[PDB]
Design a protein around this ligand. Structure first.
Ligand SMILES: [K+]
Ligand SMILES: [K+]
Ligand SMILES: [K+]
Ligand SMILES: [K+]
Ligand SMILES: [K+]
Ligand SMILES: [K+]
Ligand SMILES: [K+]
Ligand SMILES: [K+]
Ligand SMILES: [K+]
Ligand SMILES: [K+]
Ligand SMILES: [K+]
Ligand SMILES: [K+]
Ligand SMILES: [K+]
Ligand SMILES: [Mg+2]
Ligand SMILES: [Mg+2]
Ligand SMILES: [Mg+2]
Ligand SMILES: [Mg+2]
Ligand SMILES: [Mg+2]
Ligand SMILES: [Mg+2]
Ligand SMILES: [Mg+2]
Ligand SMILES: [Mg+2]
Ligand SMILES: [Mg+2]
Ligand SMILES: [Mg+2]
Ligand SMILES: [Mg+2]
Ligand SMILES: [Mg+2]
Ligand SMILES: [Mg+2]
Ligand SMILES: [Mg+2]
Ligand SMILES: [Mg+2]
Ligand SMILES: [Mg+2]
Ligand SMILES: [Mg+2]
Ligand SMILES: [Mg+2]
Ligand SMILES: [Mg+2]
Ligand SMILES: [Mg+2]
Ligand SMILES: [Mg+2]
Ligand SMILES: [Mg+2]
Ligand SMILES: [Mg+2]
Ligand SMILES: [Mg+2]
Ligand SMILES: [Mg+2]
Ligand SMILES: [Mg+2]
Ligand SMILES: [Mg+2]
Ligand SMILES: [Mg+2]
Ligand SMILES: [Mg+2]
Ligand SMILES: [Mg+2]
Ligand SMILES: [Mg+2]
Ligand SMILES: [Mg+2]
Ligand SMILES: [Zn+2]
Lengths: 68, 114, 134, 91, 251
RNA sequence: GUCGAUCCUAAGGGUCGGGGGAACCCCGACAGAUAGCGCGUCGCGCGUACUCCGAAAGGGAAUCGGGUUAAAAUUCCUGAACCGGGACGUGGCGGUUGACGGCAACGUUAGGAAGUCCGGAGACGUCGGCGGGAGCCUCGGGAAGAGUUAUCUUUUCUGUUUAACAGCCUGCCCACCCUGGAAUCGGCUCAGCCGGAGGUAGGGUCCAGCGGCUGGAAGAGCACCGCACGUGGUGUCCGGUGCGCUCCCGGCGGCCCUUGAAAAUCCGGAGGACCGAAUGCCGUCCACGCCCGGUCGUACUCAUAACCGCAUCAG
RNA sequence: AGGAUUGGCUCUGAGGGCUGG
RNA sequence: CCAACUCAGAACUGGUACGGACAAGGGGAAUCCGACUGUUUAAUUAAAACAAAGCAUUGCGAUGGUCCCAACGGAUGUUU
């Protein structure tokens, strides 16, 4: 498992053809965006809840988004 | 207190059967075999370690498993000789070669003596 | 002061260019404000020319005559002064200000390369262009 | 204080082996465990690694010497004898 | 009777030499053109201990005469040798401790070690710690040399035989008392299965000529003739004399 | 595929040729046109008579939690990784044909290369003292449940969890580098010991980690309280202590007429034959993507009843 | 060899670490 | 402000009890033998017997000493 630090980088890896699914984990102090790729599970942490909603609706169509 | 057992069929405390105790997310202690200590690269004569290279088992140095920058030193004889040893050889090579030129010239002045 | 002067051939003793031959361009015996120790600006050979022989073709010989140079500031304790001299004009090509910017450094190295190659082709200073073996 | 009147280093043998053998072995016991002058670096840092092998801690020079002393008495005589013969031949 | 201890050693088995940790045979270079005519320079890299051998050994690196490679050698270390020293082998090598020269080039009275018996055999005489041979005289007509061996015997060897200048390092080893059976145990642990030794008079008749009797005693002269067959040849073999060596006898 | 066997070599074993022998057999690479390997594309170069057996405690490519059975699991399930191969694609990198930075120790993710040559790792005794890490033990506070309660007890007990792997940080004890030039000698360990062969001091580099943070990962596990008879909620927190115990590591010292394996395998280096482009090809140990994973062992006992002793034997 | 001391309870003294010019 | 447990002393006190169980040398004056540690008759002998360091003698310079082998060869010997 690897951690993505930039939202821009997370979007780039979300558009990869091997990105099988994306899962949204909402904790009590942040939201984690996890994208399952061929080799690694990339995770992005977004402390600001409001800033996380904007990214949630910006994901490419066809990618299986799940809420945890 | 919780007591442990070997996780393999190796029942003797050999150097290759070393282990560490780890507490798992399940709340229990368990063994995990630990690889033996490795020396890492060393100088041919003095035996001092070669700086800039980690100490790993021989298979862990394999190019596919270790990045190139971690198994090299950017200098002549890098990873084989220390900086001091390389400096000694360079000076010795230059000074010895210069002395040969002096010997060659010195015998030409005496050869013509006749 | 006496022998550590420009055009004096030296041999690098440390760093990634240890064992390379170089020529002093500017000497700072007193040391600048940033560097309070004796040092000099040298233009050495990173890649020596190959062995040029008669049987090689003209195209092959031209490639084997190529030289690659480096511009660097070096402490006096990290060079070995020699009795050889290389009289090539480098006062304008190589300067302290050059090392400040990467683009300037590349241009000076290319210009220094041209003056080393032309000197090499004349057959003079064979020792300077010969690889030190150690 | 003076812990032993005369036994010295052979006090590790207690009351065993007889006084003469302890007295006899004391000479070599002291010599083989002492530091010797290094002609190369100029320091008293030469100690025995194994019988006949003497290494300097500082400069790392390893020298072949006597079993229990760096230089045996016959070793000095041999060097002078060889030196005399060399001078005559090289005359 | 049964096979006595002395007879069981020849079969090998548990009496073979313990050589697991030995560094290899110590010998001169193979005689070649360079040593026969001129000299070849070598460098001592390390002085090492050889289990079972009192004398230290020296690892020397040579430049191969006609191949592009290094030539490794293992020499019996002479007293005074040190790491980083240059060692010269050949006919024209100078007379200095550590150099290997043919006996023809070594003047009379010199101290030498690891002396060859046959030209090119790479050294058989005076190899133990503190031992040496003394060059006595040369015979240009016969091309032979006289040397005095450590035992005090004079031997004729061809002048082409090589020898190292100096004496073997590690001398004086046997002067130190062992003081303990354990020290003897460790000494012979790395040599061979020869210790401890049981006295023949302590055995039964079945396994030794000296065995038996209601008192411990030999019962017959311990001096046995040269031609006695194996199993009978025990004690003082072919003794020219016995008893304390006094006067000229101990010379 | 990940635990082993399998591979490697040890003491040694079995052998060719040769030498012996009526023969069964004996010696065992010692009497000899070795095995072949490498690079081009069949040719050149190299080439010292064993491509053999010999370790389920020596050496050694890679797997971790959680869950699951009446009986199996580091093998099954789920999730997350890794190793060894095979193939091409995209992007990146280099061309001053073969990168850049640092005075230096060295740093950075890439960043030519054949025959030949060189070094290192693998790789090593024992004892003693110190130092570091992990697990355990132990003390206090917070919260959860339980025990005691005629009396006393802000009390007693149970627990209060965090895997491989990935990134970043840290930089032990040493080693190393730069500046500088020391007697009124100083620095320094429990013990040593170190310094014009450059100390103290100042500023750096590197190395260890079973160290820290984050990802993995709370979604898990555990505890407790509910609702139904699967499902929801709460908590899993904050410190101290050590000639303590077990294991691992570091560094130093003692000891030897004792100096305490080998090979497979892997890494690095010296050398530079040969090779591209006038800028489009060539090169690339970089990132990502794609494919593949043999055979055999695996239950259970390991013992005052599963082994041997005639037995369910006080051995 | 020979001799003295040793429980419980309530105290006293001595032996440290880290911060603050 | 935070500390762990070693040492020393004093008062008081019990039916002089207190290393309260557990744990855990009897001591001395001599003779004989073997120096010591070690080893030994598994299943009647553990010893004064064996070994031992030390001491002494003997053979042998490799075309060799000692020994194994039917023969060829081999052990000591990776030796001097
Ligand atoms: K490195
Ligand atoms: K018989
Ligand atoms: K024995
Ligand atoms: K005996
Ligand atoms: K008898
Ligand atoms: K194995
Ligand atoms: K081993
Ligand atoms: K699993
Ligand atoms: K692992
Ligand atoms: K199983
Ligand atoms: K039993
Ligand atoms: K004992
Ligand atoms: K023989
Ligand atoms: Mg020093
Ligand atoms: Mg004896
Ligand atoms: Mg008897
Ligand atoms: Mg008889
Ligand atoms: Mg395995
Ligand atoms: Mg073998
Ligand atoms: Mg057979
Ligand atoms: Mg045959
Ligand atoms: Mg052969
Ligand atoms: Mg094989
Ligand atoms: Mg095998
Ligand atoms: Mg194993
Ligand atoms: Mg089971
Ligand atoms: Mg090695
Ligand atoms: Mg001890
Ligand atoms: Mg500790
Ligand atoms: Mg410093
Ligand atoms: Mg976390
Ligand atoms: Mg939970
Ligand atoms: Mg243990
Ligand atoms: Mg190169
Ligand atoms: Mg099982
Ligand atoms: Mg069971
Ligand atoms: Mg059991
Ligand atoms: Mg039976
Ligand atoms: Mg009497
Ligand atoms: Mg006794
Ligand atoms: Mg017994
Ligand atoms: Mg009995
Ligand atoms: Mg008995
Ligand atoms: Mg006596
Ligand atoms: Mg015969
Ligand atoms: Zn020295």
């Amino acid at each position: 498992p690897k951690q993505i630090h930039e939202i821009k980088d997370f979007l780039l890896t979300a558009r990869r053809k091997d990105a099988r699914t994306v899962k949204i984990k909402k904790n009590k102090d942040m939201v984690k965006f996890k994208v399952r790729c061929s080799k690694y599970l990339y995770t992005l942490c977004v402390s600001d809840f409001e800033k996380a909603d904007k990214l949630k609706q910006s994901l490419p169509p066809g990618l299986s988004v799940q809420d945890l | 207190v919780q007591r442990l057992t070997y996780r393999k069929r190796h029942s003797y405390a050999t150097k290759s059967n070393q282990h560490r105790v780890v507490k798992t997310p399940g709340g229990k202690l368990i063994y995990q075999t630990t690889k033996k200590r490795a020396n890492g690269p060393k100088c041919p004569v003095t035996g001092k370690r070669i700086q800039g290279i980690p100490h790993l088992r021989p298979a862990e140095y394999k190019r596919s498993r270790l990045s190139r920058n971690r198994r090299t030193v950017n200098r002549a004889y890098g990873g084989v000789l220390s900086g001091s040893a390389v400096r000694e050889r360079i000076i010795r090579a230059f000074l010895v070669e210069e002395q040969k030129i002096v010997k060659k010239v010195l015998k030409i002045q005496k050869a013509k003596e006749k | 002061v006496k022998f550590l002067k420009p055009n004096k051939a030296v041999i690098l003793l440390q760093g990634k260019y240890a064992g390379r031959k170089a020529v002093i361009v500017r000497a700072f015996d007193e040391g600048t404000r940033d560097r309070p120790y004796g040092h000099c600006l040298v233009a050495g050979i990173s890649k020596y020319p190959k062995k040029v022989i008669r049987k090689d073709s003209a195209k092959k010989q031209a490639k084997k005559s190529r030289v690659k140079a480096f511009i660097k500031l070096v402490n006096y304790n990290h060079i070995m002064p020699t009795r050889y001299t290389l009289d090539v004009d480098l006062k304008d090509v190589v300067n302290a200000d050059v090392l400040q910017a990467r683009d300037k450094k590349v241009t000076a190295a290319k210009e220094t390369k041209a003056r080393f190659e032309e000197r090499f082709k004349t057959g003079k200073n064979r020792w300077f262009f010969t690889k030190l073996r150690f | 204080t003076k812990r032993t009147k005369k036994a010295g280093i052979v006090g590790k043998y207690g009351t065993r082996y007889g006084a003469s053998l302890r007295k006899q072995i004391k000479k070599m016991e002291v010599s083989q465990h002492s530091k010797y002058f290094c002609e190369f670096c100029g320091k008293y840092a030469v100690k025995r690694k194994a019988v006949g092998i003497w290494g300097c801690k500082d400069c790392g020079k390893v020298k072949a010497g006597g079993a229990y002393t760096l230089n045996t008495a016959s070793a000095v005589t041999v060097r002078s004898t060889i030196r005399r013969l060399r001078e005559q031949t090289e005359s | 009777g049964r096979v006595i201890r002395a007879q069981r050693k020849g079969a090998g088995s548990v009496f073979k030499s313990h050589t697991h940790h030995r560094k290899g045979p110590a010998r001169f270079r193979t005689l070649d053109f360079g040593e026969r005519n001129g000299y070849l320079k070598g460098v001592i890299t390390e002085v090492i201990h050889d289990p079972g051998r009192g004398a230290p050994l020296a690892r020397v690196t040579f430049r191969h005469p006609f191949r592009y490679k290094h030539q490794k050698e293992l020499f019996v270390a002479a007293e005074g040798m040190y790491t980083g020293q240059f060692v010269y082998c050949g006919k024209k090598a100078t007379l200095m401790v550590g150099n290997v020269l043919p006996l023809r080039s070594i003047p009379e009275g010199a101290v030498v070690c690891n002396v060859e018996h046959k030209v090119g055999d790479r050294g058989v005489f005076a190899r133990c710690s503190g031992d040496y041979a003394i060059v006595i005289s040369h015979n240009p007509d016969n091309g032979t040399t006289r040397v005095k061996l450590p035992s005090g015997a004079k031997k004729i060897v061809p002048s082409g035989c090589r020898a190292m200048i100096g004496q073997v390092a590690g001398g004086g080893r046997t002067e130190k008392p062992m003081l303990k059976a354990g020290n003897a145990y460790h000494k012979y642990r790395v040599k061979r299965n020869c210790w401890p030794k049981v006295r023949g008079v302590a055995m039964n008749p079945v396994e030794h000529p000296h065995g038996g009797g209601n008192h411990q005693h030999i019962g017959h002269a311990s001096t046995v003739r040269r031609d006695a067959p194996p199993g009978q040849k025990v004690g003082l073999i072919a003794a020219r004399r016995t008893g304390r060596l006094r006067g000229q006898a101990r010379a």
